[PDB]
Amino acid sequence: PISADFSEVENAPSFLSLAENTDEVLKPYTGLEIQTIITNIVGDANPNQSRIFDQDRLRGNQYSAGGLVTQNAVSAIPFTNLIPRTIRVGNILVNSANRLQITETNVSEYYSNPIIATKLSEMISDQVKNNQFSTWRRDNTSLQGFNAFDIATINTAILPNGLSLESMLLKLSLLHSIKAMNVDAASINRSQYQVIDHNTVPTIGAPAVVGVNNSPVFGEDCGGNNPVYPFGGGTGAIAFHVTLQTVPDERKSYAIFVPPAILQATSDANEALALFALSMSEWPHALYTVTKQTTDLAGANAGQQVFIPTQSTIHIGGRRVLDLIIPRREIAPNPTTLVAANAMCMVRPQAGPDATAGAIPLAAGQLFNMNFIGAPAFEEWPMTSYLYSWAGRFDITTIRQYMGRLATMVGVKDAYWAAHELNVALSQVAPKMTTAAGGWAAQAANSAQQSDVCYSSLLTVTRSAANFPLANQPAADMRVYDTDPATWNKVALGLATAANLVPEQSMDVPFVVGDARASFWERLQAIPMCIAWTMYYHSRGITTLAWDNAYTDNTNKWLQKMVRNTFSTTQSVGTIIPARYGKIVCNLYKNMFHRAPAYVATSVGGKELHITHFERWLPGGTYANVYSGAGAVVNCFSPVLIPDIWCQYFTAKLPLFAGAFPPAQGQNSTKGFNSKQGLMIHRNQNNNLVAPYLEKFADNSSYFPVGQGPEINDMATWNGRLWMTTGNVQYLDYSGAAIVEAVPPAGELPVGKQIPLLAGENAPIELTNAATTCVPRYSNDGRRIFTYLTTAQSVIPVQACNRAANLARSCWLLSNVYAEPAVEDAFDTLTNSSFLDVAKSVAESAGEVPATKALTDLQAVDVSSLPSTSDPSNVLSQPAPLMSPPT
Amino acid sequence: DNSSYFPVGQGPEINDMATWNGRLWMTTGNVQYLDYSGAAIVEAVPPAGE
Amino acid sequence: YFTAKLPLFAGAFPPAQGQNSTKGFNSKQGLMIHRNQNNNLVAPYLEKFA
Amino acid sequence: RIFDQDRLRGNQYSAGGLVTQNAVSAIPFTNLIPRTIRVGNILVNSANRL
């Protein structure tokens, strides 16, 4: 919140107060929290009616330090998911000179909620045991038309991990994020196309066209009409089956049953099959492309401009070949001939409306010839082309309906919301800041600096070094959970369940799915993530070069622990453990925004720990820096990516060191802190250098002692900002010597990105659009960093710390409002009771059927011999169930 | 708040009498199906009066 | 400037005083914004009968 | 360096509403009487009695 008087900044909460862990439960951050402030919309409304094409800026009056008032000043939204692939130069569209951004994931099995066999599987085992008294081969009922021997094999040897569903739901949310772009322009912000290319102006008159494998440069059309994997460079295989017996022996252990709860629609069922095939294979299967009509700043030149979505570049390794087992239409003997097999399909697979070339060409609408016993030749298709043909037909409303049918088998609300959080964390991206004196700056068009970019975590994104397909693989950026086919098979049929797998009474998905407003919201959810990470890095004074080398440094020992505990590299009792200091950022988010991040569970010996997206990053990336006006790098600062008005205008509570400078009000303007706060001024041998009041330990260190670093003090950081915010500071040593790190040209600070204005807008003035809170303190070689003024330049600021004088600073002219976290149809009121009881019954539906053990017992030869009597089912202990105990 | 566009997540309410008045306007010879501004709707329409 | 008492609708705009300058009225006063079929036109909070 | 500590310093506010920064006022007193004086950028002797 913005301070109105110095009394408000002086009474702001300390940083340690906000990093305490909190116990209360909290609602999710939906992004409407920002929408109420930066837009007209007050209640639910048609996105097309609202023209949210023009709702993409912070706006407001600004006050200058000289006493003039600027009206209709603006600041751009920092994030976007679009990477320009053609760029404007000299008012003419031209191709990109820079290689594309890429992301890599770590994917592994981990323990989840403990799992248990259902009543129905106890039924199946009873059927086998009662059969054993006979000469007859029919062991058990064949569930949902699948072969009874297959139910017999699926119902055996369960894993103790539990099941996750995370990678699946990620692939589905990445694709939803990509197709969301395809709606009309009135519902997408202009700013999203010009976060990187600030010289282009998108036209409102046509919707953007999403396509596949089209890019002009660097071999980014991964085969074109003859598709191959963007990373592997190969091609997959996909084969369909009625029974497991036809699956080749080399890969019968990898097969996946396709549940018939999906495919229940009158239409779009073959499409549902293609989509389910997409959610369990490797991603990306192709490079998607957004194409939008755009024009020059004058609106003269016009053309189709090419963009690559970030979601289409992030790699999630999975299976390349796969085998799906289609539901049977009626219980029957397995087919021995082709016609018997084709006639027997519930949904018969076919190619989508888009022809492909190469070996095994696919015609649009082409049907598959089912595999069967005694078949002369095994049949299969390349998978990259099968996913290619349907790729242009997927859209948001169908993914919503699919996901809604999926909802009725298993819980998918929280899991999807978590995978969506991960989507937003890996996809929204901002360009690096430029230093300046004034309010705006940008790098040269079609330059390496223009396109260099960063995560909400202040880490730079790696680039490709060669033409697609990529011969080699980048270090992983983040670790996600995998979904095992075996336990998937057990759960899809009702043989097993766990607390995270329970169907939910809503029978419905998160609000973000199926909306045309989704891109705007995802763009707005990245903001809090950066606010929390920047508070994390700016609470301490380490410079970007020192982070950049911290992991291996042996100059200091504390810097190493500091780097090492910010990432996830610990495990215990077979499962993943969250980064030890990511919990601090998680704590900060809750205390500052009064909301709760989405989390998954991990079981450690049976105890549940929560893991948010903050705790799962991996070491190896480079930290964000800022460039000079000429494009030279600047190392001296703490990492930064966004201007601090975003931090301080969208919080309920903020640490004291980061607050805004208060408005002029008659005599009183700005104020500092002195020896009455326990601070002290630093002087050296040189009489023409002065540094502010600082912590008392600062007098007795020029190098930090090994095993120790700079402390949290909010007031000293405050005076550090007051010194920097004068236009003439020196970033120096205890003795007044130059530090090893590169420093900006004098008096400059990093500032936010420039975008073209609308009529009536003004550019931001002075330091009203700049990071300020990045006060350096820890040099790479272990020296302290000081901010010096000359004596004459020193007098007014020191008296201002003494509160005898006043400093003059610019501010936004804005008030504080932070909203509370917060529909029945007539038909819903008509049916509310029946919905209330049926929803309650579905929660226990599990593998349940009305028949009890007491009925089935009457049908048995011997009740005592039944495995259900001698082994009643229990939840599995972790990591392993007891085996061969000492009697 | 649904005078020209319905809010996302809401639709027209059940009101028997307005539907009745709409039948009265329709049973007159030359009804015209337009929007709030009096502009053409996207749906195909019957030749006039039918 | 020459009244002892004046109706609320007619008062002067208040002076700038640090952060705070001028202020309006919203749905918490019982008002509502008006929107039409055209997305590039906006009118203030107004009475609900409007 | 009290060589440079010889002025009143501070921001000033104007009646027209602009803010001047780093404004100064000299200390009025001294004990030194100049005996050579600068004229035309060149040092020269004093014309005035002590």
Side-chain angles (χ1 to χ4, degrees):
Chain A
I2 304 301
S3 61
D5 184 67
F6 189 74
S7 294
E8 289 185 352
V9 54
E10 188 175 2
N11 286 289
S14 66
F15 173 85
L16 290 179
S17 179
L18 297 168
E20 299 301 323
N21 59 347
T22 188
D23 197 4
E24 61 182 340
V25 292
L26 295 169
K27 293 167 65 180
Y29 193 91
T30 59
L32 270 64
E33 296 85 352
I34 290 172
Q35 180 179 352
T36 55
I37 294 169
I38 57 109
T39 314
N40 284 340
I41 291 106
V42 295
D44 189 3
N46 193 37
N48 289 334
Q49 196 182 9
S50 292
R51 190 181 177 92
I52 70 107
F53 182 82
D54 285 344
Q55 303 296 322
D56 54 351
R57 293 169 175 82
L58 176 61
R59 290 179 176 91
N61 294 342
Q62 293 176 339
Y63 173 78
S64 180
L68 297 176
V69 172
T70 291
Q71 288 174 332
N72 297 335
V74 60
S75 181
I77 296 171
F79 297 96
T80 191
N81 59 34
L82 293 175
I83 303 298
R85 188 49 52 192
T86 56
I87 195 74
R88 286 187 179 273
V89 172
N91 279 351
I92 305 297
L93 229 46
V94 306
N95 285 340
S96 180
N98 303 129
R99 284 185 169 87
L100 180 60
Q101 315 299 323
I102 58 174
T103 308
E104 180 66 17
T105 308
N106 192 31
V107 180
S108 295
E109 296 301 319
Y110 297 126
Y111 287 80
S112 300
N113 285 336
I115 195 168
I116 191 169
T118 59
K119 184 184 65 57
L120 185 139
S121 61
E122 291 176 344
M123 291 296 182
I124 294 167
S125 63
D126 278 347
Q127 292 182 337
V128 176
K129 186 55 157 57
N130 203 41
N131 186 345
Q132 289 180 333
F133 289 105
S134 178
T135 304
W136 184 55
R137 298 290 298 282
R138 178 221 186 265
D139 312 335
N140 59 341
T141 61
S142 67
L143 298 172
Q144 290 174 332
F146 292 100
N147 186 340
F149 290 95
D150 294 350
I151 288 99
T153 187
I154 298 306
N155 195 32
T156 307
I158 191 167
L159 289 168
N161 293 131
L163 179 66
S164 178
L165 298 180
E166 176 177 354
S167 58
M168 177 180 174
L169 295 175
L170 276 176
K171 296 170 185 173
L172 292 174
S173 62
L174 297 174
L175 184 64
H176 184 279
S177 292
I178 293 170
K179 308 306 290 192
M181 291 299 298
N182 205 341
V183 299
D184 64 349
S187 62
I188 294 104
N189 294 133
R190 184 186 302 188
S191 294
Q192 190 166 353
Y193 296 92
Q194 56 195 19
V195 174
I196 293 172
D197 187 5
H198 52 282
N199 293 336
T200 194
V201 178
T203 300
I204 191 174
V209 175
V210 177
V212 170
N213 292 340
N214 285 335
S215 296
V217 294
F218 297 114
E220 294 179 353
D221 53 352
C222 298
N225 198 344
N226 189 29
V228 297
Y229 287 101
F231 290 90
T235 298
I238 180 172
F240 306 92
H241 300 85
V242 176
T243 185
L244 181 60
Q245 296 298 101
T246 306
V247 175
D249 290 344
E250 184 275 336
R251 59 181 185 270
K252 292 165 63 179
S253 59
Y254 300 99
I256 294 102
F257 291 86
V258 179
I262 64 173
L263 308 175
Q264 283 294 104
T266 304
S267 297
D268 297 345
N270 57 346
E271 186 174 2
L273 181 64
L275 193 148
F276 175 85
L278 182 138
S279 65
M280 284 181 178
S281 63
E282 179 181 5
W283 178 269
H285 65 86
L287 291 175
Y288 284 82
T289 299
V290 173
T291 299
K292 182 63 182 293
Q293 187 179 358
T294 55
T295 187
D296 184 56
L297 295 173
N301 291 336
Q304 298 300 109
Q305 186 173 356
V306 179
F307 294 92
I308 297 297
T310 294
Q311 292 91 356
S312 180
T313 62
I314 62 181
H315 185 202
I316 300 170
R319 288 185 59 77
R320 303 218 170 173
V321 301
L322 62 82
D323 289 336
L324 295 177
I325 294 167
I326 307 304
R328 185 172 288 108
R329 177 174 171 80
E330 183 70 13
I331 292 174
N334 290 336
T336 305
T337 187
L338 185 145
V339 296
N342 287 342
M344 177 175 62
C345 293
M346 176 178 169
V347 174
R348 183 178 176 179
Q350 63 172 12
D354 187 3
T356 64
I360 306 102
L362 294 176
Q366 177 171 348
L367 275 65
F368 185 82
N369 289 334
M370 286 295 181
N371 290 332
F372 60 92
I373 295 98
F378 177 76
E379 289 88 0
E380 67 183 345
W381 285 348
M383 188 169 180
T384 195
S385 66
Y386 169 73
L387 261 56
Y388 178 85
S389 62
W390 285 99
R393 178 56 59 87
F394 299 117
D395 65 12
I396 302 304
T397 182
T398 194
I399 296 172
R400 171 62 180 87
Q401 298 298 99
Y402 173 89
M403 190 172 288
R405 287 174 299 180
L406 182 62
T408 58
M409 288 183 285
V410 294
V412 290
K413 190 185 178 66
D414 292 343
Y416 184 83
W417 183 249
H420 178 269
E421 292 284 315
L422 298 178
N423 186 34
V424 174
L426 295 176
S427 294
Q428 300 305 314
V429 168
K432 292 180 176 176
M433 299 175 80
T434 303
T435 60
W440 266 354
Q443 293 298 321
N446 197 345
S447 66
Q449 290 88 358
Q450 191 187 4
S451 297
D452 189 4
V453 293
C454 293
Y455 298 107
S456 297
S457 63
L458 270 56
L459 298 167
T460 191
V461 179
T462 63
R463 286 186 180 174
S464 301
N467 286 342
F468 294 148
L470 296 174
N472 58 346
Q473 187 172 353
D477 294 340
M478 184 181 283
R479 55 180 49 186
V480 303
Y481 309 177
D482 188 8
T483 298
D484 277 340
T487 184
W488 164 254
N489 291 341
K490 297 182 185 296
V491 174
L493 294 175
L495 299 173
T497 190
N500 61 334
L501 296 174
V502 174
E504 181 180 358
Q505 295 178 338
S506 177
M507 300 174 184
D508 283 337
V509 300
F511 65 95
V512 62
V513 182
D515 282 342
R517 290 175 294 184
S519 179
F520 170 68
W521 291 344
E522 292 176 352
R523 187 182 179 183
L524 294 172
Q525 292 167 338
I527 306 297
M529 293 176 176
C530 278
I531 293 172
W533 280 103
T534 58
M535 303 310 295
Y536 180 75
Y537 291 100
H538 298 168
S539 64
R540 299 292 177 90
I542 301 108
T543 65
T544 299
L545 183 66
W547 285 103
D548 196 4
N549 289 128
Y551 202 91
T552 299
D553 185 9
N554 62 346
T555 294
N556 190 340
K557 183 176 75 178
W558 170 89
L559 184 66
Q560 284 176 331
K561 180 193 290 183
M562 181 61 69
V563 71
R564 184 181 291 180
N565 292 132
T566 59
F567 303 111
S568 180
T569 56
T570 304
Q571 89 281 354
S572 177
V573 188
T575 194
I576 180 171
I577 290 179
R580 183 180 175 175
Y581 296 157
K583 182 63 173 173
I584 295 170
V585 191
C586 189
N587 286 347
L588 224 54
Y589 192 94
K590 292 174 180 176
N591 284 335
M592 289 197 286
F593 301 104
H594 191 60
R595 299 293 181 269
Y599 63 84
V600 295
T602 53
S603 180
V604 176
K607 183 180 179 180
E608 299 300 320
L609 273 63
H610 300 164
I611 297 179
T612 55
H613 67 84
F614 296 113
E615 291 101 353
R616 66 172 68 204
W617 287 91
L618 270 56
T622 299
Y623 298 82
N625 61 37
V626 298
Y627 295 98
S628 177
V633 302
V634 174
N635 294 131
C636 60
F637 294 136
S638 297
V640 288
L641 189 63
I642 64 173
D644 56 356
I645 177 63
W646 291 97
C647 298
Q648 61 195 18
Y649 182 65
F650 295 105
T651 51
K653 290 188 291 186
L654 184 67
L656 180 145
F657 67 88
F661 307 114
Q665 286 175 333
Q667 193 175 357
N668 299 322
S669 284
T670 293
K671 294 292 193 190
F673 299 94
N674 59 42
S675 62
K676 191 185 295 178
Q677 317 303 324
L679 300 180
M680 292 177 70
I681 291 171
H682 183 59
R683 297 179 183 277
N684 53 344
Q685 79 287 355
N686 189 338
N687 61 29
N688 201 27
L689 289 173
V690 181
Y693 294 90
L694 299 171
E695 62 277 4
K696 289 180 178 177
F697 175 73
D699 192 9
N700 282 284
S701 64
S702 58
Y703 292 82
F704 295 93
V706 177
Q708 189 173 355
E711 66 180 344
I712 296 100
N713 207 0
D714 287 349
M715 296 183 286
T717 304
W718 176 262
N719 292 341
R721 292 179 65 194
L722 296 181
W723 256 249
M724 290 170 65
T725 304
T726 61
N728 48 34
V729 189
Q730 289 169 325
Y731 294 100
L732 264 54
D733 183 52
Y734 82 98
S735 173
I739 60 173
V740 294
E741 296 166 344
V743 294
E748 292 186 354
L749 297 171
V751 292
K753 186 70 179 293
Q754 182 182 357
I755 59 172
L757 295 171
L758 295 175
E761 273 84 350
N762 295 288
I765 61 174
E766 297 178 355
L767 297 182
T768 313
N769 198 37
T772 301
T773 305
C774 52
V775 182
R777 289 191 290 171
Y778 187 87
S779 181
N780 187 29
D781 62 352
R783 291 199 291 269
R784 298 183 72 94
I785 299 169
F786 295 92
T787 55
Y788 297 104
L789 297 174
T790 64
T791 300
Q793 293 175 336
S794 298
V795 175
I796 288 174
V798 171
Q799 295 300 319
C801 296
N802 286 283
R803 300 178 187 174
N806 286 327
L807 262 56
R809 301 293 153 84
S810 57
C811 61
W812 293 89
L813 297 178
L814 291 168
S815 297
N816 291 133
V817 290
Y818 192 83
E820 292 298 320
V823 174
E824 297 177 353
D825 188 66
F827 287 171
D828 292 345
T829 303
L830 291 170
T831 58
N832 193 35
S833 64
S834 299
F835 183 78
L836 288 177
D837 72 352
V838 172
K840 182 178 171 62
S841 67
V842 176
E844 294 300 322
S845 291
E848 295 295 319
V849 292
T852 60
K853 181 182 177 183
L855 282 176
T856 60
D857 270 353
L858 293 172
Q859 296 182 338
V861 176
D862 182 65
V863 179
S864 63
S865 68
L866 291 177
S868 63
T869 301
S870 59
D871 275 347
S873 180
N874 291 334
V875 59
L876 296 179
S877 66
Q878 291 170 330
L882 271 63
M883 290 189 282
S884 296
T887 62
Chain B
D1 193 2
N2 59 345
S3 177
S4 61
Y5 287 87
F6 293 97
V8 179
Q10 287 178 333
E13 60 278 12
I14 296 101
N15 196 336
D16 287 347
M17 295 189 286
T19 301
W20 176 262
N21 288 345
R23 293 182 67 190
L24 294 177
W25 259 249
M26 284 181 175
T27 309
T28 58
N30 283 337
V31 191
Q32 195 168 356
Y33 304 106
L34 298 171
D35 68 350
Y36 178 73
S37 177
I41 60 173
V42 296
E43 284 87 357
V45 293
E50 267 76 355
Chain C
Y1 182 65
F2 295 105
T3 51
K5 290 188 291 186
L6 184 67
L8 180 145
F9 67 88
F13 307 114
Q17 287 174 333
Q19 193 175 357
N20 299 322
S21 284
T22 293
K23 294 292 193 190
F25 299 94
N26 59 42
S27 62
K28 191 185 295 178
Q29 317 303 324
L31 300 180
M32 292 177 70
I33 291 171
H34 183 59
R35 297 179 183 277
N36 53 344
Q37 79 287 355
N38 189 338
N39 61 29
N40 201 27
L41 289 173
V42 181
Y45 294 90
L46 299 171
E47 62 277 4
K48 289 180 178 177
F49 175 73
Chain D
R1 190 181 177 92
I2 70 107
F3 182 82
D4 285 344
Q5 303 296 322
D6 54 351
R7 293 169 175 82
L8 176 61
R9 290 179 176 91
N11 294 342
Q12 293 176 339
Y13 173 78
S14 180
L18 297 176
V19 172
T20 291
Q21 288 174 332
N22 297 335
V24 60
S25 181
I27 296 171
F29 297 96
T30 191
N31 59 34
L32 293 175
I33 303 298
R35 188 49 52 192
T36 56
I37 195 74
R38 286 187 179 273
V39 172
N41 279 351
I42 305 297
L43 229 46
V44 306
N45 285 341
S46 180
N48 303 129
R49 284 185 169 87
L50 180 60

